[PDB]
Amino acid sequence: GTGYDLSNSVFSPDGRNFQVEYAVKAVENGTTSIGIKCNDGVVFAVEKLITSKLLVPQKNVKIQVVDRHIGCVYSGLIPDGRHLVNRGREEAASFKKLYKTPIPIPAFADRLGQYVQAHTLYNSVRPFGVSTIFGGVDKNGAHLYMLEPSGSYWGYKGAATGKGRQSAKAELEKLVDHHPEGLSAREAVKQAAKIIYLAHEDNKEKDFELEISWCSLSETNGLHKFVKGDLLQEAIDFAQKEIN
Amino acid sequence: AGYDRHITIFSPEGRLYQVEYAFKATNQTNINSLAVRGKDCTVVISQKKVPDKLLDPTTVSYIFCISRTIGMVVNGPIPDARNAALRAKAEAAEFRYKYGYDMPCDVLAKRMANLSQIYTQRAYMRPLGVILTFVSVDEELGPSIYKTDPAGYYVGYKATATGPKQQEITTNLENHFKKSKIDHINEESWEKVVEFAITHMIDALGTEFSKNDLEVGVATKDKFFTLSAENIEERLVAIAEQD
Amino acid sequence: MDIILGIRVQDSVILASSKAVTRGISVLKDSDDKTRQLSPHTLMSFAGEAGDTVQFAEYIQANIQLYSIREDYELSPQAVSSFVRQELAKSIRSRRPYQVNVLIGGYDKKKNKPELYQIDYLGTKVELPYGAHGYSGFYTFSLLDHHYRPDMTTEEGLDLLKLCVQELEKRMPMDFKGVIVKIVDKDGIRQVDDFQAQ
Amino acid sequence: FRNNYDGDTVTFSPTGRLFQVEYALEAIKQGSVTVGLRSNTHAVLVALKRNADELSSYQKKIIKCDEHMGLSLAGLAPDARVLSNYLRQQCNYSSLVFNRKLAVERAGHLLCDKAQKNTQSYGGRPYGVGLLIIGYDKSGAHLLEFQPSGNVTELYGTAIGARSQGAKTYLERTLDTFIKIDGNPDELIKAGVEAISQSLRDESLTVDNLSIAIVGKDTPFTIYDGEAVAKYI
Amino acid sequence: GSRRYDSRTTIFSPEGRLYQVEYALESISHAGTAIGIMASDGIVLAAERKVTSTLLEQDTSTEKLYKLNDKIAVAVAGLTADAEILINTARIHAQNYLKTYNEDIPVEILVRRLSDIKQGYTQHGGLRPFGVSFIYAGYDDRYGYQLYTSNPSGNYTGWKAISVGANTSAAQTLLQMDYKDDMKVDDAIELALKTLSKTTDSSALTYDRLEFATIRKGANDGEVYQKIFKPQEIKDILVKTGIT
Amino acid sequence: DRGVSTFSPEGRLFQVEYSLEAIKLGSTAIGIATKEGVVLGVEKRATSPLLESDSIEKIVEIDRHIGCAMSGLTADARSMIEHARTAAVTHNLYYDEDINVESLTQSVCDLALRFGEGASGEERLMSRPFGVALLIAGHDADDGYQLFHAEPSGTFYRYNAKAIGSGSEGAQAELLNEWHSSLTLKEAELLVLKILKQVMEEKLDENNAQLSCITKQDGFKIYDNEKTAELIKELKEKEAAE
Amino acid sequence: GYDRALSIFSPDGHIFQVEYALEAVKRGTCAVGVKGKNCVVLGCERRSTLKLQDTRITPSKVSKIDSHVVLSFSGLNADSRILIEKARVEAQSHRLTLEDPVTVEYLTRYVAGVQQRYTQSGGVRPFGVSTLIAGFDPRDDEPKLYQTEPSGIYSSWSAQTIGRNSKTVREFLEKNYDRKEPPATVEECVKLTVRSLLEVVQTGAKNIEITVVKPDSDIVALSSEEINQYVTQIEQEKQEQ
Amino acid sequence: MTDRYSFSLTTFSPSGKLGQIDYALTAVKQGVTSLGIKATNGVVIATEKKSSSPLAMSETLSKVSLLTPDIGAVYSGMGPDYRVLVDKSRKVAHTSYKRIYGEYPPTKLLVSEVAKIMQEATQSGGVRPFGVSLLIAGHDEFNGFSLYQVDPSGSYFPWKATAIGKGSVAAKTFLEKRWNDELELEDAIHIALLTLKESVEGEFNGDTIELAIIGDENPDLLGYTGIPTDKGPRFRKLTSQEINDRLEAL
Amino acid sequence: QFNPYGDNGGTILGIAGEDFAVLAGDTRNITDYSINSRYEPKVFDCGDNIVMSANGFAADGDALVKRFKNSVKWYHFDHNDKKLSINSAARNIQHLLYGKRFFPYYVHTII
C-alpha cells in the first residue's frame, strides 16, 4: 500500500526511511557550506544570505566551536544544527572529564553519528534537518567529516552541502586533483572563500556575507579560530578577483 | 488494519513486513561479503566501493574490530552498522568484566540476535537494516563464523556470503566444499586463506580487483586484524602469479 | 503508665481505664476516656505514647466503621483483634512505630460469648479471662488469679474491678484520678457512671 | 498533500517542510504589529496594542525581563508569558551565580534552543508567538527578532505582525538616519513611532493604544503607556 | 507518533456501549458451556470441554474447573490463559483476607474484588479486557451456599442456577423449566448433565468431554468439602443419570 | 487521530477554538464595572420545574474582595475556583495583604493551556482545555474596581462591561451603548437585570436570575432573592415609565 | 503509561465520550427520588431480561454511603461500585478529621468531583453513571435530594428520576408533585414514588424496590409485600373510576 | 524516546476473534513439523533440522532445548521467538521455584510459568504474541512423565502424543493409529521416527533430525559423585549416531 | 567532623523614628581571634525603601539577603511593579527563614 512516509522509524517496501529523505530536502533547500582539509588543519566556510540591509553585518554567526579544537558548520534548519552542537559539546566534555585528553576528531564524529542515528530509531522523534561539516586537529593529524540526517558520516578531503553543493563539489574535486601533495592553511582560507562565491551563483538573487573559520597546527596552534579582519578581506578579494 | 505493515505486528498471513523490509535495506550499499575458515584462522572479504573523489578512502569501512578476538563485517546502511558495532563492543567489554573471560563469537552473536529479536516483538523499536557476520578463533571452538539478521536469527557457518550477489558466492563455495570433502580451507598460513577468499570472490562475481576494491579482516589465535591496501596488494600479486 | 484493665466474666467484658492525663509536672485532665468504640459490640482501650495513643485508636475505628458500611455486617471480636495485631506488627518495623498498647473487649453475637484480647505495641496478641497493660498487671494479676471465676456475673465482675482499683490506689505511686468503667455484652456498650463510689 | 503532513511537528513534508511550525508562524502575522529599532546608545520598542471591545482593555505587548533587557510580543500572549518568564530566569541566574548581566546575544541563543525542542518531539506544539528583544549589555545596544521556528536574528530595526511589511520597509529606508540617533532617546522613539504608523490602516495610534519601551547607555528598560506616550502621538 | 495505532479499548459507542466488552462477550459465546446449580445441601459445577482428541490426557487436565479456596471454586468460560491470571490474583486475595482477619474470605468479597479488577480494564489503561466469564460456587457462614457469575464488563450477579459460554439462552430456558427451590444436590447433578446433553454442539455427551465438581457439607463431619470429579467418577455418574 | 495541541493552518489551536463553541451554549453572565463597585449577574436556567433553583451556583466567592461568575461547562469551573481561592489565601499568608485582582486572574489563566498528551514545556497533565469562561470581578488599592474575562485560551481581558454565554453577542452590543464612565452601582444593577431579561429565553424573575456585587466597604456579597425581586420590580416600573 | 486524551472537544463544542456516557445512563434501569416534609424515598426498577436470580445476594440498587446517606444510580453497574466505594471512604475520612459526618451536599459534591475528573484526565473514560444522593445532614430534619451526571454537574431536586423512560416518569412527577404541599406522610411519599414507577415498570411487584430514609440515621428498605400493598391500593384508585 | 506504546496491540474484533493470536497460529502452521510421544517409562520429542544452507552448521542450532535436568522443550514457528522463550523459561525455573524450594519445578508448573509469559505478550502494551507453539516434555517425582502443548494464546493442554506445524494434521492421525498405553520408550522413539519421515521431504538421518528423550536418570551425565540423592538428569539428547542405528531397524 | 556553621561576630542596631528609621552595624568581620576585614558592609538597601541586615554566620547572612533582594525583584515581576510594603517584606522573610526550619540560617536579622 502507501503511507510509509508518515511515521519516522518505518521501513518502506524498498528498505528506505522516507522521513529521513524528507529531512534531506530541508537541507538541500538551505544555504551552502563547505570544509577543506589542508596539510595540517581544516577550513570551514559558509554563505550568509543578506535578507535585508537591517541585518547587522558580521553579527549573526553560524560556525560553532566544540571544546577548543573542533569547528562545526551546517546547512538546513539552523536550530536543529545548534541542538546537535549543544549535544556535541556535552559529549566532548564527558570525554575530557573521564580521559583528561581532549576528544579526538574520529571519536567526536561517531558521538554525533550515534546521536543522529538514534533520531531515526523511533517515531516519537524527528530526524535532524541538517547536514553538518565538522573537524579539527588532534593527537595524529587533521580530520574533516560530513554528517547526514541519516546518521551517515565519512572522512573527507573536501566537503560541501546545501544549495550550491554541486558547484562546490566540482570545485573541490579540481583542488584535490591539482594539489596531490596537499593544500596549505593559508591557501585553503582563500580557496574556500572562492568556492562560496562561486557556489553562491545558485542563489545569486540575494546578497550574501562570507564567514570563514579554521583549525591549523601551525597557524592557529591546533585551536579553532575565526578568520577576521585583514586575512578575511584578503580571501574576500581573492574570490572577488576570480569571480571575473 | 493496514498498519500491520508499519509496526512489528503479525499480518493475516502470520508475517512481519517490517522485518522483511529491514532485510531489503541490507542490500542498499550494493556490497558483497564472504567469510571462510582456515586451519587455525578466519578470513572475511568485503567489497570496497568509494564513488566520491572527495571521500577519504581510509575512513570508508564496513569491517569492525569488536574486541581483541572478535571481528564483525556488516551488510547494510552504515549508520545502522555503526549502531550495531558500538553495542557489540560495549557488550564484549561488559561480559569480560562480569565473567572473567573473553566473550566467545557465538555468544556475542546470540546476544545480538536476541537483541534484534526484541525489535521484532516490541513496537517502538525498529529493526536494524543490517546483517552481522561475527568472526574469531574461539579458544574452545576454533575458527568461527556466526551471522545474525533483522529477524533475530543466528547460526554457525563453515563458510558464508552476504549481499546482492550472495547466491553466486554461496553456490561457488558450496561446490568447492563438496569437492574438498572438508569444512575448511586446509592451509597453514592465513595469507593463503585470504588468497583463497579473494580467488573465489573473483570467480563467483566475475570481476577483477585492485588493492582499493577490497577489504580484508583476519582472525587468529588471540587477535583479529584488518589488512592495509599494501597487505592486500601483496595478496593480489600472489594470486596473479598462478593464473 | 496509665491504668488499662480488662476482665471477661460470664456474659460481658469489663474495661477499666484511668482518667488522668499528666504532662511533665501537671495533671492536665482528670476526666479522660482512654477508649474507642470500633463497632456496636466491640470496644478498645489504649495506653502509650502521647500522640500515637489517640491517633492509632481513631485510625483503627475509621477502618472498622468503613468495613461495617461496605459489607453491612459486624466483624467478630476475633477478626477485629487480628486486624489490629497486623497493624501493630507492621508498625513495629516501620520508620516511626506506634507506641500503643491495647485491650480489645467485644461480645461475639455469633458465639454468644464475651471475648478479651491483649495486644502490645510489638503486635503480641493473646486472649485472656482478664488483662492489664504496663505496671497495673504487677498488682492486679495476683488479685485476679485469686478471686476470678469464669461464671461470675457482671455485678461480681464490677466488685472484682473495685478490689483491683483499691489495690492500685494503695500501692501505686502515681495518682491516676480514678477510672472509667464500660460493659460490653449482647446489647452493646454502656458506661458505668457510678464507679466513683460503687 | 499538506493535510497528511501537518498532523504534528514531528512530521516532515515530502518537500522538507514543517507545517505545524509554519502554522504557528501564521498566528504571528495574525497578531498586532510591533516595531524595534536601535542606535548605538539606545534601543526602542514601539507596539500597537489591540482591543476586543470599546469596553475591553488594550492587551499589553511589552514585557520586562531584567534592568537591561526586554521584549515585545506578536501572537499567542500566554506563550509570550512562558518564554519571557524563561528569559527572566536566565537573566536572574546569570546575575546570582556569576554576578554578570546576561548578554543579549546569548539570550537569543537560549530562546532559540528552547523553541527548537518543541519542533522535534512528539506531543508538544511550537510556540505561537514572535518576539522582539531589545537590550544594552557590555557591547552596546541590541535588537533581536525571535521566530517560533527557532530562528533568532540581530538587526538594526525590524517589525513583526499584521501589515508589518510597511514599517519594515520604512526602517530599511530610514536606516542611515536612525542608526545615528545617539544621545537622543526622544528622537529614536519618534523614529520608531513613524515606523509603526507605516503599518496602520484601521485607526490612528491613540493614547491608550500606543505602547513604547526603551533601554540604553544610562537608561534602564522602562515602559511608557497612555499619558506617558501622549507627547509622541 | 503512536496514536496512529491506538485501538482505544476503553471508549464508548454512540449507543453508550463498550466495544471491547461486547466483543469479549461474543468471544465467550463460542467457548464450552459451563453450568452452576445451587441446591439446599450443596452446589454443583459442570463444564463441557471445548475440542478433544484421542491423545488428549484428560487425567492431568483441568481447563474449566479451578479451586480458588477450600470453600470457593470457579467455572471458566473463555480464554484459559486469561482466566489463570485472574485465578491467581483471586487465590492471593483469599489468603490476604485470611492472614488479616484470621477468618475465611466471604464469597461475595472475593467475587467483588475480581469483578472490580475486570472493571479496571474497562475504564482505564488502554489494554484489552479479559476474555473470561466466571461461575463462582462457594460457601460462607453468613449466606451459606452461594452462586455468582462475572463477565468481562466487571458486573456480577447471584443465581440459583446459571450457565455461561455457548448456548446460554437455550440452557437458561431449560434450567428455568426444571429447577425447584427445594432441590437436592443429586437432583441438581442430574439437571446439570441433562441441560448440557441437550445444548451440546457435539454428537454424544461422553465423560472425556466433561468436568464436574460439587460443594457439599458432608453430613458425617460438619465442615464443607470440595469434590472435583475424577475421569472415572464422571463416567459412573453419566451412566447412573441415564445417558451412558 | 490528531494531537490535542495541534495548530490549524490559520494559526489557531483546534481544542481551544472548539472549547469556545461550548462556552456559546452556556448560560448568560454579565459584568458591569463602576466607580461604586462591580456587578455580576447570571442566568440560572433550570432544566426542569422540579429542580430547586437556589442550588444553582454560578456566582462564587474567591476572596472577600474578589468574586467570579461562570458560563459554559460549570463542572470544569470547580478546580479553577479551588485554585483561585487557594492562590488568594496563599498570597495573604506569604505577604500579609490582599492579592491583586489582575494577579489572581493571571494565576487562574496560567492553568488554561496546561493541557496535552505530553507537551514539551513542563508537566501539563490535563486531557483537554476548560469548557468554561470566567468573569472575575474585584477591588484592590492599586487599581480600584476591576472586571476581567478569563478564557480557556490562557488570555484575559479587562472590561468596563462584558457579557458571556448564549446571548453574549447581543447583550454585549447593548452594554456598548448603555455603559458610561459615571454609572452608579444602582444604575448598573438595573442594567444587568435589564440586559439579562432581553437575552434570556424565560421571563426573568428572582428565581431564574441571580445578582451580586463587590464593594471596597463590604466586599463580595450575593444578592438574596428578596433583594433582587425588588430590583426587578424597580426595573419594570422604570421601563414602563417610557 | 497510558494517557491518550479520550475525552476531548469536537468542532461543535461537545465531549462525545461524556455525551455517550449519558446514553449508557439512558439504557440503565430507571431510578426515582422524591422528598417529603420529613423523609426522602428512593425507587428503583428491576430488570427482567433474565429471571432466576438469588435476591438475597444479588447487589441491591440503593447503597449506603454512611448511616445517614444513601446513593441510587442508573447506568453501568460496574462503574457505580467505584463511585460508591470512593464516597464511602471519603465519608469516613470526613468523620476522622472534621469530627462530624458529611452533609448530603458535601458527599454529592465529592462524588460529582470524581466524575468530572474522569472527563478531563488522560487515558480514562467517563463514568457511565448518573446518581441520586439522598439523606439528612447531621442533627437536621430537612430532607435532602441531589442528582449527579457523567459531566460532573450536580444539583438538588424536589423530585427527580434517571435512566430508561425517565422522560415519562419525570413528566408524571412534574404534574403530580406540589412544592407547596409535599407528601406530608411517609406513606403518601412512598405512594407517589410507586405511582411514578408504575407508569414505566408495567406491573412489577417484584420489579420495584423502595427505600425510606428518615432523619437521624433511620434507613429501611420495604419488602415485596409492603410494596405490593401500595401497588394493589393504587390499581384500585384507577378502577374506582 | 520512551516506549509510548502503552496500549494493547491484540484486541477483540466484532466477531470475537483475537486477530494477532490467530495470525500467530498461522505462523506456527508454516513452521517445520515437531512432535511428542509419551510412553510408560519416558517421553520422546523430535523435530526436523531444516538447514537453510549446506554451508550452515546445523549442530550449532538446537530446536530441542533443556529447561531443567528433567524438562525439555521443542517448537514449531518462529525460531528467534523460541530462543528467547527458552532463556526466559530456564530463568523462571530458578527465580520462581528453585531459589525458593531448593528443587526444580514440576513439569506442569514450569509449563504454566511459560504460558503466563506468552499470555502477557497477548495483553501487555505495545507487543505482539509469540509466533510459536511449544511442546514441553518432563518428569517429576509426584506426577511421573508428562507432555504439554503451549500455544501463542497462552493456553496449554496435556497430551499422550501430538504434532504441531506443517503436517500436523497428517502426523496427529498417524499417531492415533500407533499409540497405546503400554508403549515402551524405545517403541515411542520408533513411532516418532516413523511419523517424522512423512514430514521430511529430503534427507532423513541423524544430521537432519533432532531428537531428545525424558527417560531414566543418567549418573554418567551428572558430572560428580558422592551425593546418593543426586543420580543425574533424565533429559538426554540423542546423538547423530544413536539416531542412525535406530533408522536401520525402520 | 564537618561543622557547617561559623561565627563572624559583628553587631547591628535598628531604631525607628516618627517619620524615619535607621539600621546601623559595625564593619568588622572576624573569625575566632583574627580580623578578616575592617570594612565588610553588613546593612543593605534592598529596594522599595527597605534596609536589611542578617548578622551572625556571614555565609548564611549573605545568602538570605541575596534571596530576599531577589524576592523583591520577583514581587515586581508578578504584581505589576507594586511596592513591597515593610509589613509584607517582614512576612516574606519569615517564610524565607522557616523554609530552612531544620537547617536554619544561623543569623539574627533586622529590617
Side-chain angles (χ1 to χ4, degrees), chain C residues 5-20:
Chain C
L5 300 173
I7 182 161
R8 157 175 63 81
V9 290
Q10 178 81 304
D11 302 309
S12 60
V13 191
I14 313 163
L15 298 179
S17 306
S18 58
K19 301 194 281 182

Side-chain angles (χ1 to χ4, degrees), chain B residues 7-14 16 37 110 113-114 117 120-124 146 151-160 170 173-174 177, chain H residues 1-5 9 20 23-24 26-27 30 52-57 60-61 78 80-81 83-84 87 121 125-131:
Chain B
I7 55 169
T8 47
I9 64 164
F10 289 116
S11 70
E13 299 82 49
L16 301 174
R37 297 185 301 160
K110 185 191 174 178
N114 279 164
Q117 186 279 150
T120 285
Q121 196 164 190
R122 300 210 69 88
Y124 87 110
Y146 289 84
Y153 172 87
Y154 97 105
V155 70
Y157 297 87
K158 309 165 189 178
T160 192
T170 310
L173 293 158
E174 279 179 31
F177 290 114
Chain H
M1 216 271 285
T2 305
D3 192 344
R4 305 210 74 159
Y5 293 88
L9 294 182
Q20 288 293 305
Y23 309 152
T26 304
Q30 325 285 219
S52 299
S53 185
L55 285 172
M57 307 184 294
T60 65
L61 220 179
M78 299 170 75
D81 278 17
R83 195 180 62 248
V84 302
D87 292 328
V127 286
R128 58 156 189 84
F130 292 97

Side-chain angles (χ1 to χ4, degrees), chain B residues 32-48:
Chain B
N32 297 289
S33 69
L34 71 83
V36 284
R37 297 185 301 160
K39 205 166 175 65
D40 54 4
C41 75
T42 317
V43 178
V44 295
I45 283 289
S46 186
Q47 287 183 297
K48 189 172 178 171

Side-chain angles (χ1 to χ4, degrees), chain A residues 7-12 15-21 120, chain B residues 126:
Chain A
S7 214
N8 189 345
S9 59
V10 183
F11 281 110
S12 57
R16 288 156 67 183
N17 183 349
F18 274 88
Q19 274 291 146
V20 167
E21 289 175 26
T120 71
Chain B
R126 74 159 179 91

Side-chain angles (χ1 to χ4, degrees), chain C residues 67 71-72 76 78-79 82-83 86 110, chain E residues 97 99-103 109 112 141-142:
Chain C
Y67 188 101
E71 258 65 62
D72 186 42
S76 65
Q78 200 286 139
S82 293
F83 171 82
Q86 195 169 76
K110 183 161 264 69
Chain E
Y97 189 98
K99 186 166 71 72
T100 301
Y101 301 103
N102 271 295
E103 290 183 357
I109 303 169
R112 192 203 295 115
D141 68 315
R142 186 193 165 174

